């Protein structure tokens, strides 16, 4: 039960904040919150411990704090060596064990701020015959590389049936990601329309499909 | 039992946890209570679990 | 009879429950209690009862 945002941007040198939202069973109790930095492929290094203390060889740039039921990490003086995933970690009593966060993808800039570029394909007839249905949501040419998809059937979100891919570097050095939705054929037919909405940092980009 | 001829010096401690939850983590739910007593000493100790700096 | 036992009244102190004196003489063999225990701020109450008459 520790909630961190998915992504945060930032230009070299600017200051950025990462939030570690917790409940009363983990940070609300007397338990301390630590942070960990995971560079690509590398294993996590210990970062801020004891909510504000940093171990040897950690710059002043990284500064931790904690307030009530949440914690916060602060990075000032962004460099390329800082682009990584960051995790907060504390202890929970109602679960009787330690707990980590979801992680936050720190993207340092140095590129434009392009967005998707979503294209959505509805189920093909040939697969409806085989008693199957799968909608295909494609995303290309976006920077930085961290999106958040959400599927709807003309009003209502769909929690199950969704498989979402990890972004990866394009040849055009940008990022690319796809997400597929699995449906039964009559579920596809017995609805007005469907929509794959994709949120990049501050923009929702949505497509739409209707049975014909 | 102080089996010797000089007087003995007995020293113990009380653990003040950071919260009512950490105390249940270490020792379990319930009120924690230490009772010390000799032929002339009669006291009792209770931890004070709560927030601190 | 211990001096504090003149208040609580263990058996040894039955004869002093309502004593009256100008000079109160304590002994080493005094026992303020029969069921074990001890008074809080016992020396203060002792100093009170010594000048009590």
PDB file of C-alpha atoms in Angstrom:
ATOM      1  CA  UNK A   1       0.000   0.000   0.000  1.00  0.00           C
ATOM      2  CA  UNK A   2       2.485   2.651  -1.253  1.00  0.00           C
ATOM      3  CA  UNK A   3       1.505   4.817  -4.228  1.00  0.00           C
ATOM      4  CA  UNK A   4       4.066   6.614  -6.393  1.00  0.00           C
ATOM      5  CA  UNK A   5       3.411   8.447  -9.668  1.00  0.00           C
ATOM      6  CA  UNK A   6       4.418   6.618 -12.857  1.00  0.00           C
ATOM      7  CA  UNK A   7       6.554   9.315 -14.503  1.00  0.00           C
ATOM      8  CA  UNK A   8       8.155  12.726 -13.923  1.00  0.00           C
ATOM      9  CA  UNK A   9      10.025  14.891 -16.449  1.00  0.00           C
ATOM     10  CA  UNK A  10      12.554  17.675 -15.953  1.00  0.00           C
ATOM     11  CA  UNK A  11      15.275  19.677 -17.684  1.00  0.00           C
ATOM     12  CA  UNK A  12      18.949  19.299 -16.680  1.00  0.00           C
ATOM     13  CA  UNK A  13      19.581  21.208 -13.473  1.00  0.00           C
ATOM     14  CA  UNK A  14      15.940  21.849 -12.584  1.00  0.00           C
ATOM     15  CA  UNK A  15      14.394  20.517  -9.365  1.00  0.00           C
ATOM     16  CA  UNK A  16      11.807  17.727  -9.369  1.00  0.00           C
ATOM     17  CA  UNK A  17       9.694  16.051  -6.678  1.00  0.00           C
ATOM     18  CA  UNK A  18       8.649  12.410  -6.343  1.00  0.00           C
ATOM     19  CA  UNK A  19       5.797  11.613  -3.963  1.00  0.00           C
ATOM     20  CA  UNK A  20       5.442   8.487  -1.836  1.00  0.00           C
ATOM     21  CA  UNK A  21       1.802   8.415  -0.721  1.00  0.00           C
ATOM     22  CA  UNK A  22       1.170   5.981   2.116  1.00  0.00           C
ATOM     23  CA  UNK A  23      -1.548   4.847   4.494  1.00  0.00           C
ATOM     24  CA  UNK A  24      -1.800   4.987   8.290  1.00  0.00           C
ATOM     25  CA  UNK A  25      -0.573   1.376   8.585  1.00  0.00           C
ATOM     26  CA  UNK A  26       2.850   2.084   7.043  1.00  0.00           C
ATOM     27  CA  UNK A  27       4.033   5.717   7.234  1.00  0.00           C
ATOM     28  CA  UNK A  28       1.278   6.823   9.602  1.00  0.00           C
ATOM     29  CA  UNK A  29       2.804   4.543  12.207  1.00  0.00           C
ATOM     30  CA  UNK A  30       6.269   5.349  13.515  1.00  0.00           C
ATOM     31  CA  UNK A  31       7.951   3.605  10.563  1.00  0.00           C
ATOM     32  CA  UNK A  32      10.602   5.368   8.489  1.00  0.00           C
ATOM     33  CA  UNK A  33      10.651   5.650   4.682  1.00  0.00           C
ATOM     34  CA  UNK A  34      13.745   5.010   2.546  1.00  0.00           C
ATOM     35  CA  UNK A  35      14.462   5.434  -1.156  1.00  0.00           C
ATOM     36  CA  UNK A  36      16.327   3.387  -3.767  1.00  0.00           C
ATOM     37  CA  UNK A  37      17.726   4.274  -7.203  1.00  0.00           C
ATOM     38  CA  UNK A  38      17.703   1.666  -9.980  1.00  0.00           C
ATOM     39  CA  UNK A  39      19.656   2.635 -13.098  1.00  0.00           C
ATOM     40  CA  UNK A  40      18.973   0.649 -16.305  1.00  0.00           C
ATOM     41  CA  UNK A  41      19.937  -2.993 -15.884  1.00  0.00           C
ATOM     42  CA  UNK A  42      21.772  -2.149 -12.699  1.00  0.00           C
ATOM     43  CA  UNK A  43      20.407  -3.236  -9.333  1.00  0.00           C
ATOM     44  CA  UNK A  44      19.084  -0.601  -6.905  1.00  0.00           C
ATOM     45  CA  UNK A  45      21.618   1.427  -4.931  1.00  0.00           C
ATOM     46  CA  UNK A  46      20.639   2.613  -1.496  1.00  0.00           C
ATOM     47  CA  UNK A  47      19.517   6.256  -1.560  1.00  0.00           C
ATOM     48  CA  UNK A  48      17.944   8.357   1.230  1.00  0.00           C
ATOM     49  CA  UNK A  49      17.425   6.325   4.442  1.00  0.00           C
ATOM     50  CA  UNK A  50      15.734   7.408   7.665  1.00  0.00           C
ATOM     51  CA  UNK A  51      13.561   9.785   5.554  1.00  0.00           C
ATOM     52  CA  UNK A  52      16.305  12.407   5.233  1.00  0.00           C
ATOM     53  CA  UNK A  53      19.729  10.756   5.654  1.00  0.00           C
ATOM     54  CA  UNK A  54      21.852   9.809   2.664  1.00  0.00           C
ATOM     55  CA  UNK A  55      24.700   7.249   2.716  1.00  0.00           C
ATOM     56  CA  UNK A  56      28.279   7.836   1.617  1.00  0.00           C
ATOM     57  CA  UNK A  57      28.775   8.942  -1.972  1.00  0.00           C
ATOM     58  CA  UNK A  58      25.230  10.273  -2.469  1.00  0.00           C
ATOM     59  CA  UNK A  59      25.144  13.937  -3.576  1.00  0.00           C
ATOM     60  CA  UNK A  60      23.338  16.755  -1.803  1.00  0.00           C
ATOM     61  CA  UNK A  61      21.145  16.949  -4.932  1.00  0.00           C
ATOM     62  CA  UNK A  62      19.047  14.098  -3.540  1.00  0.00           C
ATOM     63  CA  UNK A  63      17.116  15.249  -0.473  1.00  0.00           C
ATOM     64  CA  UNK A  64      14.436  13.245   1.321  1.00  0.00           C
ATOM     65  CA  UNK A  65      11.640  14.281   3.658  1.00  0.00           C
ATOM     66  CA  UNK A  66       8.530  12.849   5.302  1.00  0.00           C
ATOM     67  CA  UNK A  67       5.291  14.463   6.447  1.00  0.00           C
ATOM     68  CA  UNK A  68       2.415  12.677   8.157  1.00  0.00           C
ATOM     69  CA  UNK A  69       1.299   9.794   5.919  1.00  0.00           C
ATOM     70  CA  UNK A  70       3.435  10.689   2.872  1.00  0.00           C
ATOM     71  CA  UNK A  71       7.097  11.072   1.978  1.00  0.00           C
ATOM     72  CA  UNK A  72       8.895  12.987  -0.728  1.00  0.00           C
ATOM     73  CA  UNK A  73      12.165  12.792  -2.628  1.00  0.00           C
ATOM     74  CA  UNK A  74      13.714  15.866  -4.258  1.00  0.00           C
ATOM     75  CA  UNK A  75      16.308  15.966  -7.056  1.00  0.00           C
ATOM     76  CA  UNK A  76      18.024  19.278  -7.840  1.00  0.00           C
ATOM     77  CA  UNK A  77      20.759  19.482 -10.446  1.00  0.00           C
ATOM     78  CA  UNK A  78      19.537  16.836 -12.856  1.00  0.00           C
ATOM     79  CA  UNK A  79      22.185  15.010 -14.878  1.00  0.00           C
ATOM     80  CA  UNK A  80      22.159  12.074 -17.277  1.00  0.00           C
ATOM     81  CA  UNK A  81      23.460   9.776 -14.542  1.00  0.00           C
ATOM     82  CA  UNK A  82      20.211  10.536 -12.645  1.00  0.00           C
ATOM     83  CA  UNK A  83      17.804   9.133 -15.260  1.00  0.00           C
ATOM     84  CA  UNK A  84      16.593   5.926 -13.575  1.00  0.00           C
ATOM     85  CA  UNK A  85      13.698   4.286 -11.728  1.00  0.00           C
ATOM     86  CA  UNK A  86      13.180   5.333  -8.110  1.00  0.00           C
ATOM     87  CA  UNK A  87      11.421   3.338  -5.395  1.00  0.00           C
ATOM     88  CA  UNK A  88      10.305   4.310  -1.902  1.00  0.00           C
ATOM     89  CA  UNK A  89      10.231   1.612   0.752  1.00  0.00           C
ATOM     90  CA  UNK A  90       8.867   1.457   4.297  1.00  0.00           C
ATOM     91  CA  UNK A  91       7.330  -1.097   6.680  1.00  0.00           C
ATOM     92  CA  UNK A  92       3.654  -1.996   7.072  1.00  0.00           C
ATOM     93  CA  UNK A  93       2.163  -3.397  10.292  1.00  0.00           C
ATOM     94  CA  UNK A  94      -1.265  -4.650   9.160  1.00  0.00           C
ATOM     95  CA  UNK A  95       0.586  -6.782   6.570  1.00  0.00           C
ATOM     96  CA  UNK A  96       3.506  -7.540   8.962  1.00  0.00           C
ATOM     97  CA  UNK A  97       6.359  -6.876   6.574  1.00  0.00           C
ATOM     98  CA  UNK A  98       8.240  -4.333   4.536  1.00  0.00           C
ATOM     99  CA  UNK A  99       6.700  -2.730   1.470  1.00  0.00           C
ATOM    100  CA  UNK A 100       8.056  -1.000  -1.620  1.00  0.00           C
ATOM    101  CA  UNK A 101       6.427   1.421  -4.024  1.00  0.00           C
ATOM    102  CA  UNK A 102       5.409   1.069  -7.636  1.00  0.00           C
ATOM    103  CA  UNK A 103       8.463   2.998  -8.775  1.00  0.00           C
ATOM    104  CA  UNK A 104       8.754   6.300 -10.604  1.00  0.00           C
ATOM    105  CA  UNK A 105      10.373   6.611 -14.027  1.00  0.00           C
ATOM    106  CA  UNK A 106      12.633   9.649 -13.976  1.00  0.00           C
ATOM    107  CA  UNK A 107      13.135  10.920 -17.521  1.00  0.00           C
ATOM    108  CA  UNK A 108      15.728  13.655 -17.904  1.00  0.00           C
ATOM    109  CA  UNK A 109      15.056  15.775 -20.981  1.00  0.00           C
ATOM    110  CA  UNK A 110      17.421  16.590 -23.828  1.00  0.00           C
ATOM    111  CA  UNK A 111      14.835  15.966 -26.500  1.00  0.00           C
ATOM    112  CA  UNK A 112      11.497  17.422 -27.632  1.00  0.00           C
ATOM    113  CA  UNK A 113       8.165  16.691 -25.942  1.00  0.00           C
ATOM    114  CA  UNK A 114       6.256  14.815 -28.657  1.00  0.00           C
ATOM    115  CA  UNK A 115       3.046  12.950 -27.842  1.00  0.00           C
ATOM    116  CA  UNK A 116       1.148  10.058 -29.497  1.00  0.00           C
ATOM    117  CA  UNK A 117       0.167   9.327 -32.360  1.00  0.00           C
ATOM    118  CA  UNK A 118      -2.292   6.619 -31.303  1.00  0.00           C
ATOM    119  CA  UNK A 119      -3.897   4.391 -33.960  1.00  0.00           C
ATOM    120  CA  UNK A 120      -6.549   1.843 -32.972  1.00  0.00           C
ATOM    121  CA  UNK A 121      -7.628  -1.269 -34.931  1.00  0.00           C
ATOM    122  CA  UNK A 122     -10.953  -3.035 -34.206  1.00  0.00           C
ATOM    123  CA  UNK A 123     -11.286  -6.839 -34.269  1.00  0.00           C
ATOM    124  CA  UNK A 124     -11.017  -8.356 -37.730  1.00  0.00           C
ATOM    125  CA  UNK A 125     -13.791 -10.437 -39.245  1.00  0.00           C
ATOM    126  CA  UNK A 126     -11.513 -13.463 -39.685  1.00  0.00           C
ATOM    127  CA  UNK A 127     -10.934 -13.693 -35.936  1.00  0.00           C
ATOM    128  CA  UNK A 128     -14.574 -13.060 -35.032  1.00  0.00           C
ATOM    129  CA  UNK A 129     -15.290 -16.279 -36.984  1.00  0.00           C
ATOM    130  CA  UNK A 130     -12.866 -18.164 -34.725  1.00  0.00           C
ATOM    131  CA  UNK A 131     -14.942 -16.917 -31.757  1.00  0.00           C
ATOM    132  CA  UNK A 132     -12.384 -14.360 -30.603  1.00  0.00           C
ATOM    133  CA  UNK A 133     -11.984 -10.589 -30.467  1.00  0.00           C
ATOM    134  CA  UNK A 134      -8.922  -8.443 -29.733  1.00  0.00           C
ATOM    135  CA  UNK A 135      -8.641  -4.672 -30.201  1.00  0.00           C
ATOM    136  CA  UNK A 136      -5.190  -3.259 -30.957  1.00  0.00           C
ATOM    137  CA  UNK A 137      -4.004   0.134 -29.652  1.00  0.00           C
ATOM    138  CA  UNK A 138      -0.739   1.369 -31.195  1.00  0.00           C
ATOM    139  CA  UNK A 139       1.417   4.202 -29.866  1.00  0.00           C
ATOM    140  CA  UNK A 140       4.516   5.645 -31.541  1.00  0.00           C
ATOM    141  CA  UNK A 141       6.589   8.839 -31.679  1.00  0.00           C
ATOM    142  CA  UNK A 142       6.312  10.119 -28.131  1.00  0.00           C
ATOM    143  CA  UNK A 143       8.864  11.581 -25.688  1.00  0.00           C
ATOM    144  CA  UNK A 144       9.366  10.922 -22.883  1.00  0.00           C
ATOM    145  CA  UNK A 145       8.653   7.186 -22.790  1.00  0.00           C
ATOM    146  CA  UNK A 146       5.990   6.699 -20.117  1.00  0.00           C
ATOM    147  CA  UNK A 147       2.268   6.574 -20.883  1.00  0.00           C
ATOM    148  CA  UNK A 148      -0.870   5.426 -19.066  1.00  0.00           C
ATOM    149  CA  UNK A 149      -3.596   3.689 -21.069  1.00  0.00           C
ATOM    150  CA  UNK A 150      -7.236   3.167 -20.111  1.00  0.00           C
ATOM    151  CA  UNK A 151      -9.914   1.353 -22.116  1.00  0.00           C
ATOM    152  CA  UNK A 152     -13.604   2.261 -22.166  1.00  0.00           C
ATOM    153  CA  UNK A 153     -16.745   0.887 -23.807  1.00  0.00           C
ATOM    154  CA  UNK A 154     -18.258   4.232 -24.892  1.00  0.00           C
ATOM    155  CA  UNK A 155     -18.550   5.211 -21.205  1.00  0.00           C
ATOM    156  CA  UNK A 156     -17.139   2.646 -18.843  1.00  0.00           C
ATOM    157  CA  UNK A 157     -13.570   1.487 -18.106  1.00  0.00           C
ATOM    158  CA  UNK A 158     -12.479  -2.123 -18.643  1.00  0.00           C
ATOM    159  CA  UNK A 159     -10.141  -3.496 -15.972  1.00  0.00           C
ATOM    160  CA  UNK A 160      -9.641  -7.033 -17.344  1.00  0.00           C
ATOM    161  CA  UNK A 161      -8.557  -8.335 -20.730  1.00  0.00           C
ATOM    162  CA  UNK A 162      -5.874  -5.630 -21.095  1.00  0.00           C
ATOM    163  CA  UNK A 163      -2.244  -6.459 -21.898  1.00  0.00           C
ATOM    164  CA  UNK A 164       0.039  -3.415 -22.077  1.00  0.00           C
ATOM    165  CA  UNK A 165       3.581  -3.400 -23.419  1.00  0.00           C
ATOM    166  CA  UNK A 166       6.682  -1.795 -21.966  1.00  0.00           C
ATOM    167  CA  UNK A 167       7.926   1.220 -23.968  1.00  0.00           C
ATOM    168  CA  UNK A 168      11.182   0.913 -25.879  1.00  0.00           C
ATOM    169  CA  UNK A 169      13.497   3.097 -27.941  1.00  0.00           C
ATOM    170  CA  UNK A 170      12.427   3.628 -31.537  1.00  0.00           C
ATOM    171  CA  UNK A 171      14.890   3.813 -34.390  1.00  0.00           C
ATOM    172  CA  UNK A 172      13.847   7.579 -34.529  1.00  0.00           C
ATOM    173  CA  UNK A 173      15.355   7.485 -30.957  1.00  0.00           C
ATOM    174  CA  UNK A 174      11.761   8.124 -29.559  1.00  0.00           C
ATOM    175  CA  UNK A 175       9.560   5.576 -27.754  1.00  0.00           C
ATOM    176  CA  UNK A 176       6.894   3.076 -28.890  1.00  0.00           C
ATOM    177  CA  UNK A 177       4.273   0.994 -27.076  1.00  0.00           C
ATOM    178  CA  UNK A 178       1.230  -1.156 -27.876  1.00  0.00           C
ATOM    179  CA  UNK A 179      -1.698  -2.421 -25.800  1.00  0.00           C
ATOM    180  CA  UNK A 180      -4.170  -5.188 -26.697  1.00  0.00           C
ATOM    181  CA  UNK A 181      -7.672  -5.816 -25.313  1.00  0.00           C
ATOM    182  CA  UNK A 182      -9.261  -9.290 -25.274  1.00  0.00           C
ATOM    183  CA  UNK A 183     -13.038  -9.539 -25.709  1.00  0.00           C
ATOM    184  CA  UNK A 184     -15.758 -12.032 -26.518  1.00  0.00           C
ATOM    185  CA  UNK A 185     -17.428 -11.395 -29.906  1.00  0.00           C
ATOM    186  CA  UNK A 186     -20.895 -10.491 -28.607  1.00  0.00           C
ATOM    187  CA  UNK A 187     -19.344  -8.193 -25.972  1.00  0.00           C
ATOM    188  CA  UNK A 188     -17.808  -6.394 -28.944  1.00  0.00           C
ATOM    189  CA  UNK A 189     -21.169  -6.341 -30.753  1.00  0.00           C
ATOM    190  CA  UNK A 190     -23.301  -5.524 -27.676  1.00  0.00           C
ATOM    191  CA  UNK A 191     -21.882  -2.059 -27.003  1.00  0.00           C
ATOM    192  CA  UNK A 192     -22.132   1.307 -28.715  1.00  0.00           C
ATOM    193  CA  UNK A 193     -18.398   1.848 -29.148  1.00  0.00           C
ATOM    194  CA  UNK A 194     -14.959   1.379 -27.586  1.00  0.00           C
ATOM    195  CA  UNK A 195     -12.139   3.826 -26.900  1.00  0.00           C
ATOM    196  CA  UNK A 196      -8.457   3.348 -26.023  1.00  0.00           C
ATOM    197  CA  UNK A 197      -7.399   6.531 -24.227  1.00  0.00           C
ATOM    198  CA  UNK A 198      -3.688   7.138 -23.648  1.00  0.00           C
ATOM    199  CA  UNK A 199      -2.379   9.764 -21.240  1.00  0.00           C
ATOM    200  CA  UNK A 200       1.064  11.270 -21.824  1.00  0.00           C
ATOM    201  CA  UNK A 201       2.316  13.729 -19.234  1.00  0.00           C
ATOM    202  CA  UNK A 202      -0.525  16.241 -19.454  1.00  0.00           C
ATOM    203  CA  UNK A 203      -2.501  15.181 -22.514  1.00  0.00           C
ATOM    204  CA  UNK A 204      -5.137  12.523 -23.114  1.00  0.00           C
ATOM    205  CA  UNK A 205      -5.151  11.158 -26.677  1.00  0.00           C
ATOM    206  CA  UNK A 206      -8.046   8.828 -27.496  1.00  0.00           C
ATOM    207  CA  UNK A 207      -9.232   6.712 -30.415  1.00  0.00           C
ATOM    208  CA  UNK A 208     -12.627   5.125 -31.023  1.00  0.00           C
ATOM    209  CA  UNK A 209     -14.125   2.057 -32.730  1.00  0.00           C
ATOM    210  CA  UNK A 210     -17.704   0.918 -33.390  1.00  0.00           C
ATOM    211  CA  UNK A 211     -19.024  -2.404 -34.746  1.00  0.00           C
ATOM    212  CA  UNK A 212     -20.086  -2.431 -38.388  1.00  0.00           C
TER     213      UNK A 212
ATOM    214  CA  UNK B   1      19.783 -13.769  44.408  1.00  0.00           C
ATOM    215  CA  UNK B   2      22.780 -11.673  45.421  1.00  0.00           C
ATOM    216  CA  UNK B   3      24.971 -14.487  46.773  1.00  0.00           C
ATOM    217  CA  UNK B   4      27.846 -12.102  47.638  1.00  0.00           C
ATOM    218  CA  UNK B   5      28.936  -9.896  50.535  1.00  0.00           C
ATOM    219  CA  UNK B   6      29.029  -6.471  48.832  1.00  0.00           C
ATOM    220  CA  UNK B   7      25.778  -4.843  47.632  1.00  0.00           C
ATOM    221  CA  UNK B   8      24.769  -5.573  44.025  1.00  0.00           C
ATOM    222  CA  UNK B   9      23.834  -3.081  41.284  1.00  0.00           C
ATOM    223  CA  UNK B  10      20.930  -4.244  39.100  1.00  0.00           C
ATOM    224  CA  UNK B  11      20.245  -2.271  35.913  1.00  0.00           C
ATOM    225  CA  UNK B  12      17.456  -2.779  33.390  1.00  0.00           C
ATOM    226  CA  UNK B  13      15.799  -0.856  30.588  1.00  0.00           C
ATOM    227  CA  UNK B  14      12.434   0.077  29.122  1.00  0.00           C
ATOM    228  CA  UNK B  15      11.861   0.290  25.350  1.00  0.00           C
ATOM    229  CA  UNK B  16       9.758   3.252  24.226  1.00  0.00           C
ATOM    230  CA  UNK B  17       8.624   2.310  20.713  1.00  0.00           C
ATOM    231  CA  UNK B  18       7.844   4.935  18.085  1.00  0.00           C
ATOM    232  CA  UNK B  19       4.146   4.084  17.878  1.00  0.00           C
ATOM    233  CA  UNK B  20       1.451   1.867  19.333  1.00  0.00           C
ATOM    234  CA  UNK B  21       1.930  -0.235  16.172  1.00  0.00           C
ATOM    235  CA  UNK B  22       5.676  -0.860  16.481  1.00  0.00           C
ATOM    236  CA  UNK B  23       5.162  -2.026  20.065  1.00  0.00           C
ATOM    237  CA  UNK B  24       2.708  -4.657  18.784  1.00  0.00           C
ATOM    238  CA  UNK B  25       5.254  -5.523  16.073  1.00  0.00           C
ATOM    239  CA  UNK B  26       8.019  -6.255  18.606  1.00  0.00           C
ATOM    240  CA  UNK B  27       6.097  -7.701  21.542  1.00  0.00           C
ATOM    241  CA  UNK B  28       2.500  -8.097  20.350  1.00  0.00           C
ATOM    242  CA  UNK B  29      -0.823  -6.410  21.006  1.00  0.00           C
ATOM    243  CA  UNK B  30      -1.707  -5.713  24.614  1.00  0.00           C
ATOM    244  CA  UNK B  31      -0.495  -3.360  27.328  1.00  0.00           C
ATOM    245  CA  UNK B  32       3.174  -3.971  28.140  1.00  0.00           C
ATOM    246  CA  UNK B  33       4.207  -3.917  31.770  1.00  0.00           C
ATOM    247  CA  UNK B  34       7.430  -4.467  33.731  1.00  0.00           C
ATOM    248  CA  UNK B  35       7.371  -5.013  37.505  1.00  0.00           C
ATOM    249  CA  UNK B  36      10.543  -4.840  39.604  1.00  0.00           C
ATOM    250  CA  UNK B  37      10.761  -5.737  43.277  1.00  0.00           C
ATOM    251  CA  UNK B  38      13.155  -6.572  46.103  1.00  0.00           C
ATOM    252  CA  UNK B  39      12.958  -6.570  49.914  1.00  0.00           C
ATOM    253  CA  UNK B  40      12.989  -2.742  49.957  1.00  0.00           C
ATOM    254  CA  UNK B  41      12.151  -1.777  46.324  1.00  0.00           C
ATOM    255  CA  UNK B  42       8.650  -1.716  44.856  1.00  0.00           C
ATOM    256  CA  UNK B  43       8.051  -0.086  41.474  1.00  0.00           C
ATOM    257  CA  UNK B  44       6.567  -0.805  38.061  1.00  0.00           C
ATOM    258  CA  UNK B  45       7.253   0.526  34.581  1.00  0.00           C
ATOM    259  CA  UNK B  46       5.170   1.055  31.447  1.00  0.00           C
ATOM    260  CA  UNK B  47       6.521   2.159  28.051  1.00  0.00           C
ATOM    261  CA  UNK B  48       5.369   5.411  26.512  1.00  0.00           C
ATOM    262  CA  UNK B  49       4.898   4.568  22.819  1.00  0.00           C
ATOM    263  CA  UNK B  50       4.370   7.661  20.706  1.00  0.00           C
ATOM    264  CA  UNK B  51       5.841   9.980  18.118  1.00  0.00           C
ATOM    265  CA  UNK B  52       9.198  11.698  18.685  1.00  0.00           C
ATOM    266  CA  UNK B  53      11.897  13.467  16.677  1.00  0.00           C
TER     267      UNK B  53
ATOM    268  CA  UNK C   1       5.580  -1.425  65.439  1.00  0.00           C
ATOM    269  CA  UNK C   2       6.718   0.799  62.599  1.00  0.00           C
ATOM    270  CA  UNK C   3       5.766   4.449  62.677  1.00  0.00           C
ATOM    271  CA  UNK C   4       3.790   4.289  59.413  1.00  0.00           C
ATOM    272  CA  UNK C   5       2.019   1.143  60.653  1.00  0.00           C
ATOM    273  CA  UNK C   6       0.278   3.328  63.239  1.00  0.00           C
ATOM    274  CA  UNK C   7      -1.835   4.573  60.302  1.00  0.00           C
ATOM    275  CA  UNK C   8      -2.589   1.283  58.508  1.00  0.00           C
ATOM    276  CA  UNK C   9      -2.593  -0.890  61.626  1.00  0.00           C
ATOM    277  CA  UNK C  10      -0.836  -4.221  61.183  1.00  0.00           C
ATOM    278  CA  UNK C  11      -1.020  -6.522  64.239  1.00  0.00           C
ATOM    279  CA  UNK C  12       2.228  -5.296  65.831  1.00  0.00           C
ATOM    280  CA  UNK C  13       0.769  -1.773  65.799  1.00  0.00           C
ATOM    281  CA  UNK C  14      -2.596  -2.517  67.449  1.00  0.00           C
ATOM    282  CA  UNK C  15      -1.316  -0.995  70.701  1.00  0.00           C
ATOM    283  CA  UNK C  16      -0.442   2.327  69.032  1.00  0.00           C
ATOM    284  CA  UNK C  17      -3.468   2.978  66.812  1.00  0.00           C
ATOM    285  CA  UNK C  18      -4.279   6.187  68.687  1.00  0.00           C
ATOM    286  CA  UNK C  19      -1.030   6.823  70.494  1.00  0.00           C
ATOM    287  CA  UNK C  20      -0.154  10.231  71.904  1.00  0.00           C
ATOM    288  CA  UNK C  21       3.349  11.380  72.781  1.00  0.00           C
ATOM    289  CA  UNK C  22       5.816  14.249  72.988  1.00  0.00           C
ATOM    290  CA  UNK C  23       8.812  11.989  72.199  1.00  0.00           C
ATOM    291  CA  UNK C  24       8.407   9.197  69.625  1.00  0.00           C
ATOM    292  CA  UNK C  25      11.104   6.496  69.749  1.00  0.00           C
ATOM    293  CA  UNK C  26      11.653   4.312  66.655  1.00  0.00           C
ATOM    294  CA  UNK C  27      13.468   0.971  66.668  1.00  0.00           C
ATOM    295  CA  UNK C  28      15.309  -1.017  64.021  1.00  0.00           C
ATOM    296  CA  UNK C  29      12.876  -3.954  64.414  1.00  0.00           C
ATOM    297  CA  UNK C  30       9.870  -1.848  63.377  1.00  0.00           C
ATOM    298  CA  UNK C  31       7.755  -3.129  60.494  1.00  0.00           C
ATOM    299  CA  UNK C  32       5.375  -0.660  58.836  1.00  0.00           C
ATOM    300  CA  UNK C  33       3.515  -3.497  57.049  1.00  0.00           C
ATOM    301  CA  UNK C  34       2.139  -6.995  57.508  1.00  0.00           C
ATOM    302  CA  UNK C  35       0.907  -7.576  53.979  1.00  0.00           C
ATOM    303  CA  UNK C  36       3.958  -6.430  51.955  1.00  0.00           C
ATOM    304  CA  UNK C  37       4.017  -2.993  50.369  1.00  0.00           C
ATOM    305  CA  UNK C  38       5.361   0.511  50.784  1.00  0.00           C
ATOM    306  CA  UNK C  39       4.132   4.094  51.111  1.00  0.00           C
ATOM    307  CA  UNK C  40       4.801   6.642  48.400  1.00  0.00           C
ATOM    308  CA  UNK C  41       6.838   9.582  49.724  1.00  0.00           C
ATOM    309  CA  UNK C  42       7.250   7.513  52.865  1.00  0.00           C
ATOM    310  CA  UNK C  43       9.999   9.597  54.417  1.00  0.00           C
ATOM    311  CA  UNK C  44       7.941  12.773  54.031  1.00  0.00           C
ATOM    312  CA  UNK C  45       5.006  11.213  55.879  1.00  0.00           C
ATOM    313  CA  UNK C  46       7.511   9.932  58.456  1.00  0.00           C
ATOM    314  CA  UNK C  47       8.828  13.463  59.049  1.00  0.00           C
ATOM    315  CA  UNK C  48       5.185  14.571  59.360  1.00  0.00           C
ATOM    316  CA  UNK C  49       4.281  11.942  61.951  1.00  0.00           C
ATOM    317  CA  UNK C  50       7.470  12.507  63.955  1.00  0.00           C
ATOM    318  CA  UNK C  51       6.364  16.074  64.798  1.00  0.00           C
ATOM    319  CA  UNK C  52       2.697  15.013  65.110  1.00  0.00           C
ATOM    320  CA  UNK C  53       2.310  14.560  68.874  1.00  0.00           C
TER     321      UNK C  53
END
